[PDB]
Amino acid sequence: YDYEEARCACPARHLNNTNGTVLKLLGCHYFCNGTLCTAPDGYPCYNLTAQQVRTLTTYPNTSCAVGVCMKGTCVKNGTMEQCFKT
Amino acid sequence: PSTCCLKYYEKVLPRRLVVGYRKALNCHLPAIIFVTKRNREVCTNPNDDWVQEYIKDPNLPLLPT
C-alpha cells in the first residue's frame, strides 16, 4: 500500500446539473482523508460567488458559471448552466 | 451518483486490503472505487487489467453506496 498514491485518489462530491453534461466540482479543490487536494488541470468546475454558494440548494435555481481548473483556479469559459446540490 | 474520482491510484492495490468495490463510471474520470478494510475509498482506472480481474472475482462484492 502506497499512502502517497492513495492520498488524493478518493471520490469527491460534485454538483449536479439540469442539462445532461458532465458532473462538475465546486471550485478546484477537494478533501480526502484530512488532506486538501487539488483537481487536475482541465477538470470541469463551477466558479460560484460567495453568495451563490450560501444560497445553493438541492433546487435548480442557481445559474452557475462553468469553468476549467488551471493551477487550482476555476477558469470561467463563458458557459452558464443550472447547478444544484444532492 | 454524485461522487466522482479526480485522480487514479496508479499501483496495484493489495487484494488482501480490499473489502468490495463500487462503480463511478458516469463521471469526468470514470473509475472503479475499491473500499479497503480501513474504510478508505481508492479510485482506480477501469482499463487496468488488475482492476478488471478484481471486479470479476465472485468473492469480491459490489458495495451499495
Author numbering:
A (entry chain A): 15 to 100
B (entry chain B): 14 to 78
Which passages does the manuscript contain on this structure?
Evasins are chemokine-binding proteins from tick saliva, whose application as anti-inflammatory therapeutics will require manipulation of their chemokine target selectivity. Here we describe subclass A3 evasins, which are unique to the tick genus Amblyomma and distinguished from “classical” class A1 evasins by an additional disulfide bond near the chemokine recognition interface. The A3 evasin EVA-AAM1001 (EVA-A) bound to CC chemokines and inhibited their receptor activation. Structures of chemokine-bound EVA-A revealed a deep hydrophobic pocket, unique to A3 evasins, that interacts with the residue immediately following the CC motif of the chemokine.
To understand how class A3 evasins achieve chemokine binding and inhibition, we purified and crystallised complexes of EVA-A bound to human CCL7, CCL11, CCL16 and CCL17, and solved their structures at resolutions of 1.51–2.01 Å. All four structures display the same fold and 1:1 stoichiometry. In all four chemokine complexes described here, the N-terminus of EVA-A is in contact with the chemokine N-loop. In the EVA-A:chemokine structures, the side chain of the chemokine CC + 1 residue (Tyr in CCL7; Phe in CCL11, Leu in CCL16 and CCL17) sits in a deep hydrophobic pocket within the evasin structure, possibly enabling the ~35° rotation of the chemokine relative to its position in class A1 evasin complexes. To verify the contribution of the CC + 1 residue to affinity, we mutated this residue to Ala in CCL7, CCL11 and CCL16. Surprisingly, CCL16(L19A) exhibited only slightly reduced affinity for EVA-A. Thus, we conclude that the preference of EVA-A for CCL16 over CCL7 and CCL11 is because the aromatic residues in the latter two chemokines are energetically disfavoured, a phenomenon known as negative selection. Here, we found that the preference of EVA-A for chemokines with aliphatic CC + 1 residues results from negative selection against some chemokines with aromatic CC + 1 residues.
